[PDB]
Design a protein around this motif. Structure first.
Motif, PDB file in Angstrom:
ATOM      1  N   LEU B 656     -28.321  27.456   3.803  1.00 43.89           N
ATOM      2  CA  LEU B 656     -29.047  26.197   3.951  1.00 43.89           C
ATOM      3  C   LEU B 656     -28.419  25.081   3.123  1.00 43.89           C
ATOM      4  CD1 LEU B 656     -31.650  25.479   5.601  1.00 43.89           C
ATOM      5  CD2 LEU B 656     -31.066  27.901   5.514  1.00 43.89           C
ATOM      6  N   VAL B 657     -28.155  25.341   1.843  1.00 47.41           N
ATOM      7  CA  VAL B 657     -27.691  24.287   0.947  1.00 47.41           C
ATOM      8  C   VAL B 657     -26.279  23.865   1.327  1.00 47.41           C
ATOM      9  CG1 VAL B 657     -29.188  24.900  -0.982  1.00 47.41           C
ATOM     10  CG2 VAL B 657     -26.935  25.995  -0.748  1.00 47.41           C
ATOM     11  N   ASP B 658     -25.537  24.762   1.976  1.00 53.75           N
ATOM     12  CA  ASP B 658     -24.138  24.524   2.303  1.00 53.75           C
ATOM     13  C   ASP B 658     -23.963  23.823   3.646  1.00 53.75           C
ATOM     14  OD1 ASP B 658     -21.496  24.562   1.614  1.00 53.75           O
ATOM     15  OD2 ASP B 658     -21.110  26.565   2.436  1.00 53.75           O
ATOM     16  N   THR B 659     -24.960  23.054   4.079  1.00 57.62           N
ATOM     17  CA  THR B 659     -24.938  22.401   5.382  1.00 57.62           C
ATOM     18  C   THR B 659     -23.933  21.254   5.425  1.00 57.62           C
ATOM     19  OG1 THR B 659     -27.308  22.885   5.350  1.00 57.62           O
ATOM     20  CG2 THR B 659     -26.482  21.631   7.217  1.00 57.62           C
ATOM     21  N   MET B 660     -23.301  20.943   4.294  1.00 58.90           N
ATOM     22  CA  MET B 660     -22.546  19.700   4.197  1.00 58.90           C
ATOM     23  C   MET B 660     -21.030  19.874   4.299  1.00 58.90           C
ATOM     24  SD  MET B 660     -23.282  18.894   0.162  1.00 58.90           S
ATOM     25  CE  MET B 660     -25.056  18.998   0.381  1.00 58.90           C
ATOM     26  N   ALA B 661     -20.432  20.740   3.480  1.00 61.52           N
ATOM     27  CA  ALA B 661     -18.976  20.756   3.395  1.00 61.52           C
ATOM     28  C   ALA B 661     -18.380  22.158   3.347  1.00 61.52           C
ATOM     29  CB  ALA B 661     -18.515  19.961   2.172  1.00 61.52           C
ATOM     30  N   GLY B 662     -19.211  23.178   3.155  1.00 62.21           N
ATOM     31  CA  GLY B 662     -18.694  24.521   2.983  1.00 62.21           C
ATOM     32  C   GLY B 662     -18.169  25.161   4.250  1.00 62.21           C
ATOM     33  N   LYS B 663     -18.063  26.490   4.246  1.00 66.25           N
ATOM     34  CA  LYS B 663     -17.571  27.235   5.398  1.00 66.25           C
ATOM     35  C   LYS B 663     -18.687  27.971   6.126  1.00 66.25           C
ATOM     36  CE  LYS B 663     -13.994  27.375   6.559  1.00 66.25           C
ATOM     37  NZ  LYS B 663     -13.302  26.471   7.517  1.00 66.25           N
ATOM     38  N   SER B 664     -19.901  27.969   5.578  1.00 63.23           N
ATOM     39  CA  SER B 664     -21.024  28.579   6.280  1.00 63.23           C
ATOM     40  C   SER B 664     -21.345  27.905   7.613  1.00 63.23           C
ATOM     41  CB  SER B 664     -22.260  28.592   5.369  1.00 63.23           C
ATOM     42  OG  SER B 664     -23.352  29.236   6.002  1.00 63.23           O
ATOM     43  N   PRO B 665     -21.282  26.566   7.763  1.00 62.41           N
ATOM     44  CA  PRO B 665     -21.446  25.984   9.104  1.00 62.41           C
ATOM     45  C   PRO B 665     -20.234  26.216   9.992  1.00 62.41           C
ATOM     46  CG  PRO B 665     -22.054  24.414   7.390  1.00 62.41           C
ATOM     47  CD  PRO B 665     -21.310  25.522   6.723  1.00 62.41           C
ATOM     48  N   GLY B 666     -19.826  27.473  10.132  1.00 62.54           N
ATOM     49  CA  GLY B 666     -18.682  27.824  10.936  1.00 62.54           C
ATOM     50  C   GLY B 666     -19.066  28.635  12.155  1.00 62.54           C
ATOM     51  N   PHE B 675     -28.752  22.110  23.102  1.00 62.40           N
ATOM     52  CA  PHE B 675     -29.933  22.704  23.718  1.00 62.40           C
ATOM     53  C   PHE B 675     -30.415  23.956  22.993  1.00 62.40           C
ATOM     54  CE2 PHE B 675     -27.916  20.820  27.722  1.00 62.40           C
ATOM     55  CZ  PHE B 675     -28.564  19.618  27.528  1.00 62.40           C
ATOM     56  N   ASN B 676     -29.779  24.360  21.892  1.00 60.92           N
ATOM     57  CA  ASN B 676     -30.170  25.554  21.154  1.00 60.92           C
ATOM     58  C   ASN B 676     -31.155  25.252  20.033  1.00 60.92           C
ATOM     59  OD1 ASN B 676     -28.707  27.332  22.730  1.00 60.92           O
ATOM     60  ND2 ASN B 676     -27.616  28.251  20.996  1.00 60.92           N
ATOM     61  N   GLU B 677     -31.984  24.221  20.197  1.00 59.78           N
ATOM     62  CA  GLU B 677     -32.982  23.815  19.210  1.00 59.78           C
ATOM     63  C   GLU B 677     -32.357  23.431  17.875  1.00 59.78           C
ATOM     64  OE1 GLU B 677     -35.903  23.232  20.705  1.00 59.78           O
ATOM     65  OE2 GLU B 677     -34.551  24.008  22.251  1.00 59.78           O
ATOM     66  N   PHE B 678     -31.315  22.600  17.897  1.00 66.92           N
ATOM     67  CA  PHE B 678     -30.714  22.134  16.654  1.00 66.92           C
ATOM     68  C   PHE B 678     -30.784  20.614  16.542  1.00 66.92           C
ATOM     69  CE2 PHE B 678     -27.421  21.145  13.560  1.00 66.92           C
ATOM     70  CZ  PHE B 678     -27.594  22.135  12.617  1.00 66.92           C
ATOM     71  N   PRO B 679     -31.952  20.037  16.256  1.00 68.50           N
ATOM     72  CA  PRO B 679     -31.967  18.652  15.773  1.00 68.50           C
ATOM     73  C   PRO B 679     -31.706  18.627  14.277  1.00 68.50           C
ATOM     74  CG  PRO B 679     -33.955  19.217  17.039  1.00 68.50           C
ATOM     75  CD  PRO B 679     -33.306  20.489  16.606  1.00 68.50           C
ATOM     76  N   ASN B 680     -31.926  19.779  13.639  1.00 69.65           N
ATOM     77  CA  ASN B 680     -31.772  20.027  12.212  1.00 69.65           C
ATOM     78  C   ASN B 680     -31.721  21.531  11.975  1.00 69.65           C
ATOM     79  OD1 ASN B 680     -31.709  17.395  10.972  1.00 69.65           O
ATOM     80  ND2 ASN B 680     -33.902  17.203  11.400  1.00 69.65           N
ATOM     81  N   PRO B 681     -30.989  21.995  10.963  1.00 69.95           N
ATOM     82  CA  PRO B 681     -30.984  23.434  10.653  1.00 69.95           C
ATOM     83  C   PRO B 681     -32.276  23.913  10.008  1.00 69.95           C
ATOM     84  CG  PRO B 681     -29.622  22.226   9.099  1.00 69.95           C
ATOM     85  CD  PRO B 681     -29.999  21.250  10.169  1.00 69.95           C
ATOM     86  N   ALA B 682     -33.288  23.044   9.957  1.00 67.89           N
ATOM     87  CA  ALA B 682     -34.551  23.334   9.287  1.00 67.89           C
ATOM     88  C   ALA B 682     -35.206  24.615   9.794  1.00 67.89           C
ATOM     89  CB  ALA B 682     -35.516  22.157   9.451  1.00 67.89           C
ATOM     90  N   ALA B 683     -35.494  24.681  11.096  1.00 69.67           N
ATOM     91  CA  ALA B 683     -36.148  25.860  11.659  1.00 69.67           C
ATOM     92  C   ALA B 683     -35.331  27.128  11.454  1.00 69.67           C
ATOM     93  CB  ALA B 683     -36.418  25.651  13.151  1.00 69.67           C
TER      94      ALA B 683
END
Lengths: 192, 754
Positions: B656-666, B675-683
């Motif tokens: 969650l915290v790495d939503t900005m610059a890391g490699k987890s959003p890979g 269409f996969n319910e991503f307006p935000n990684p919140a849910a």
């Protein structure tokens, strides 16, 4: 293409007269190479040129050059034409030799062989013993002009002011005719 | 743009040659952007009639004339005089040379449409209005509207334009039948487009309701699409929209939302009751903010459904409609039941010799008077006699709702007479066997019909078995739903042959929908009843999800439904691959059951693996750690999965915290956050928090203790340079957990520290 270059030296000789000379010959010609004074796009398009105006050697013990004009985008040139200061002999030989060396390095570097053309006007009567003192060239004003004319057929014409000094006769020592034939009361022709 | 263009040409073209031809067949817009902006500056200069039209293209004349290819389709058509020849860069339909009357399946977006947005805006608008002027003169050949449906950004940036177009098309209900506008788009709009602006979608709801009301709709026999779309959209908006957007529907409910859609109103109030739980919109006060719901209560009591009469009305902060208990009149005081039975008996005896009279007798429909006779017919080996079929299809166009209501009530009352098992054998041998071919209801309205009476306390012990046989009733058509698994899931976003796929599908298997399976003396085929059929019956899932919700969350008292629902999901897994909203699907199931979930958790210990098992029917390559958790929680679930929960917590909060610059959003998020319910990684944080360990006694206290141990105790994995972000993530999580978890936390904190 239309890769032409403009060189003047009569700044020290005639300051106020230079303004009228500009507004009568150069300023209209500037519109032939620009869609209008604003800016405008400028890049390596071949049509770029230089702008060389300096003074004579008498009142110059520590300064001869302050030029900076790679492209000027056909706007900064006419911009600083008006915005320039002013100030016997003219020492135009040094400026002519520098412009010659610049044209040489252009032809040797800016190739495409490229049908180089140029125009030079100087109201001041030029006469000096030194020629270059900076490069291989060595001689006099007469030697400089016969070198610029005879050795290479660089297209050059001289539309002098209506006043004529005792220099036109001696300036006919070049085998290529100076071509002062365009002497007409009609206004400045675009391209004769 | 002059100085901007100058600086861009200076910065980008920083060299002394004309390098980088940059063919780049996959993607070259970024490369040829210089040529495009050059062409645009030249066009603007020519339009301004000055600046010598930016002459001397000597610098980049090569790239300037690279146009003389799909990749080279850099459309500068937007200016002018490039709408005939350069438009042909995209292959259109073939109308000069010679149902399934449309070749050239649709184009994919990423290929070329990803860039060409500024040009194609209202081209199809002219076509649709020219069609709407006179009439739908011919069966619609353009199927390219599929591409038009995959266009969100256009209305997202030109909402004013599309609104004006819709307003100008509105008089088409007086112009020609209002038909050429709805069926053209509604099905793809509901299918291809899931997420949409809330105000926009509620205005569309109001507009479709108004169009359904006026003008005349009795001729649209396939209007069921409208109802399905409305119910599917109204369910996907009730998460956090009511409380902020109340100002956007101050007057729209006050004008028209209860003309004829009683079932829709009931589903709406059910979704409202579900939403109210999140987040305490009515728990604080009692009736101060009740002004928002008093008008809705009045509108619904104008037709008074939902008449439990204060029996199990517990899923509310304060039941206000509970006062109106006398409106129930169940089974007409138990005495008019036999009277209407004798009445329909006498009516059958008359119908024996009143064929020429029953036509003029069935005027006004009389829903709870005549339709109950349908049990007697088709019991005589298809005694249709086609005398009233035409009159029915002509008159009951509206009253069919009450008709099927009475029919469902009568059939459930008839089947409830078992009461012990002495009839079950007779049921199995004849009763459930004859009802198969060929029921006309096709499980359309049975949901609320059953919810009205079967869920009542009166005879729950047998209504349970009624529901049980109802869900087990499909045993001849369920095979189609079963084999329908590898038809939509393989091709849902990567369209390559979907057109011919669904064409062949709805051609081979079905033969008709309005007529019966009997071939009379003369049979003129003339197949024309097929305007638009992209999906035949895959759409039923969006309506079935509320059914499966109301059959578990409302019917939970009896446990053997667990054995049924697991088989249900094992059979409908492939059908479940259309959307995933478990948060509202499971959060409400714990509104007040925590003190007693042990009874439900004894089977939820398997239902968790059932739900995640059904969720396994999805191949987007979007999960690589929940499966590891599953692996570490497959043997002896009463020992292992408690301790390493902290590890999972640190991992998820790090993602969650790495939503900005890391490699987890890979490899976790991909393809394409549309269409996969991503307006935000919140849910995606709350995704697993609940379902983690609802099996054992882990909830209540141990969950909160575990969540707080990462705070008061220095976790090894916890680094001491980014604590604030971690605390923020824990807060993000805990704000989305059921009451007791974040309630006991306060008491524990103030317990001994203070």
């Amino acid at each position: 293409v239309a890769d032409v270059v403009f060189v003047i030296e009569g700044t020290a000789n005639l300051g106020p007269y230079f303004e009228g000379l500009r507004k009568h010959y150069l300023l209209p010609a500037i519109e032939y190479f620009n869609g209008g004074p604003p800016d405008f796009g400028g890049d390596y398009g071949g049509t770029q040129y230089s702008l060389v105006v300096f003074n004579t050697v008498d009142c110059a013990p520590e300064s001869y050059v302050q030029c900076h004009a790679p492209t000027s985008s056909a706007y900064e040139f006419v911009t600083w034409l008006d915005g320039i200061k002013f100030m016997s002999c003219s020492l135009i030989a040094e400026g002519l030799s520098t412009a010659l060396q610049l044209f040489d390095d252009f032809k040797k570097m800016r190739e495409q062989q490229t049908h180089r053309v140029c125009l030079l006007i100087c109201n001041s009567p030029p006469y000096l013993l030194p020629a270059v003192e900076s490069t291989t060239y060595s001689g006099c004003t007469t030697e400089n002009l016969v070198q610029q004319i005879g050795e290479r057929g660089i297209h050059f014409s001289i539309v002098s002011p209506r006043k004529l000094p005792a220099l036109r006769l001696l300036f006919e020592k070049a085998a290529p005719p100076a071509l002062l034939e365009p002497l007409q009361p009609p206004t400045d022709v675009s391209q004769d | 743009f002059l100085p901007v263009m100058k600086l861009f040409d200076l910065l980008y073209p920083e060299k002394e040659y004309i390098p980088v031809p940059d063919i780049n067949k996959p993607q070259s817009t970024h490369a040829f952007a210089m040529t495009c902006i050059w062409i645009h500056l030249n066009r603007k200069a020519q339009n301004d009639n000055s600046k010598l039209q930016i002459p001397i293209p000597h610098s980049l004349r090569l790239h300037h004339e690279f146009l003389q290819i799909a990749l080279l389709c850099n459309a500068y058509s937007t200016n002018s005089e490039c709408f005939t020849l350069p438009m042909g860069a995209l292959v259109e339909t073939i109308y000069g040379n010679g149902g399934s009357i449309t070749p050239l399946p649709m184009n994919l977006l990423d290929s070329l449409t990803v860039h060409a947005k500024m040009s194609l805006i209202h081209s199809i608008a002219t076509r649709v209005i020219k069609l709407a002027h006179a009439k739908s003169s011919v069966a619609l050949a353009p199927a390219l509207v599929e591409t038009y449906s995959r266009l969100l950004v256009y209305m997202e940036i030109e909402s004013l334009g599309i609104k004006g177009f819709i307003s100008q098309l509105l008089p088409t209900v007086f112009k020609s039948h209002a038909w050429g506008i709805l069926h053209t788009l509604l099905e793809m709009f509901s299918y291809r487009m899931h997420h949409i602006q809330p105000h926009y979608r509620v205005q569309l709801l109001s507009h479709l309701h108004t169009l359904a009301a006026v003008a005349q709709t009795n001729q649209n026999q396939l209007h069921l699409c409208v109802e399905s779309t409305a119910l599917r959209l109204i369910t996907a908006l009730g998460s956090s929209e009511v409380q902020p957007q109340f100002t956007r529907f101050l007057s729209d409910p006050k004008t028209v939302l209860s003309a004829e859609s009683e079932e829709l109103n009931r589903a709406l109030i059910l979704t409202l009751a579900r939403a109210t739980h999140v987040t305490d919109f009515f728990t604080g006060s009692d009736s101060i903010q009740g002004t928002w719901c008093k008008d809705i209560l009045q509108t619904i009591m104008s037709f008074t459904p939902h008449n439990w009469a204060s029996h199990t009305l517990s899923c509310f902060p304060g039941p206000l409609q509970a006062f109106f208990k006398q409106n129930n009149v169940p089974q007409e005081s138990r005495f008019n039941l036999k009277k209407n039975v004798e009445e329909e008996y006498r009516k059958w005896k008359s119908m024996s010799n009143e064929n020429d009279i029953i036509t003029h007798f069935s005027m006004q429909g009389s829903p709870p008077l005549f339709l109950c006779l349908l049990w007697k017919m088709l019991l005589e080996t298809d005694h249709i006699n086609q005398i009233g079929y035409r009159v029915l299809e002509r008159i009951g166009a509206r009253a069919l709702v009450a008709h099927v209501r009475t029919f469902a009530d009568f059939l459930v009352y008839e089947f409830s007479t078992s009461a012990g098992g002495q009839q079950l054998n007779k049921c199995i041998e004849i009763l459930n066997d004859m009802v198969w071919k060929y029921n006309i209801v096709t499980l359309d309205r049975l949901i609320l019909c059953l919810a009205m009476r079967s869920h009542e306390g009166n005879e729950a012990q047998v209504c349970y078995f009624i529901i049980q046989l109802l869900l087990l009733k499909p045993n001849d058509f369920r095979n189609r739903v079963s084999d329908f698994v590898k038809e939509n899931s393989p091709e849902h976003w990567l369209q390559n042959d979907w057109h011919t796929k669904h064409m062949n599908y709805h051609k081979k298997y079905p033969e008709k929908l309005y007529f019966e399976g009997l071939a009379e003396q003369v049979d003129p085929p003339v197949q024309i009843q097929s305007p638009y059929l992209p999906i035949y019956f895959g759409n039923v899932c969006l309506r079935f999800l509320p059914v499966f919700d109301i059959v578990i969350h409302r019917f939970l008292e009896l446990l053997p439904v667990s054995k049924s629902l697991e088989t249900l999901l094992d059979h409908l897994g492939g059908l479940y691959k259309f959307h995933d909203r478990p948060v509202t699907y499971l959060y409400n199931t714990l509104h007040y059951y925590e003190m007693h979930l042990r009874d439900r958790a004894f089977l939820k210990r398997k239902l968790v693996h059932a739900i995640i098992g059904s969720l396994k029917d999805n191949r987007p390559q979007g999960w690589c750690l929940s499966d590891t958790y599953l692996k570490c929680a497959m043997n002896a679930r009463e020992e292992n999965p408690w301790v390493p929960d902290d590890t999972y917590y640190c991992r998820l909060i790090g993602r969650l915290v790495d939503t900005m610059a890391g490699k987890s959003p890979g490899p976790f998020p991909n393809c394409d956050w549309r269409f996969n319910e991503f307006p935000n990684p919140a849910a995606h944080a709350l995704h697993v928090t609940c379902v983690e360990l609802m099996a054992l006694a882990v909830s209540g206290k141990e969950v909160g203790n575990a969540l707080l141990n990462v705070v008061l105790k220095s976790q090894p994995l916890v680094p001491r340079e980014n604590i604030t972000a971690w605390m923020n993530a824990i807060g993000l999580i805990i704000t989305a957990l059921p009451e007791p978890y974040w309630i006991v936390l306060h008491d524990r904190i103030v317990s001994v520290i203070s």
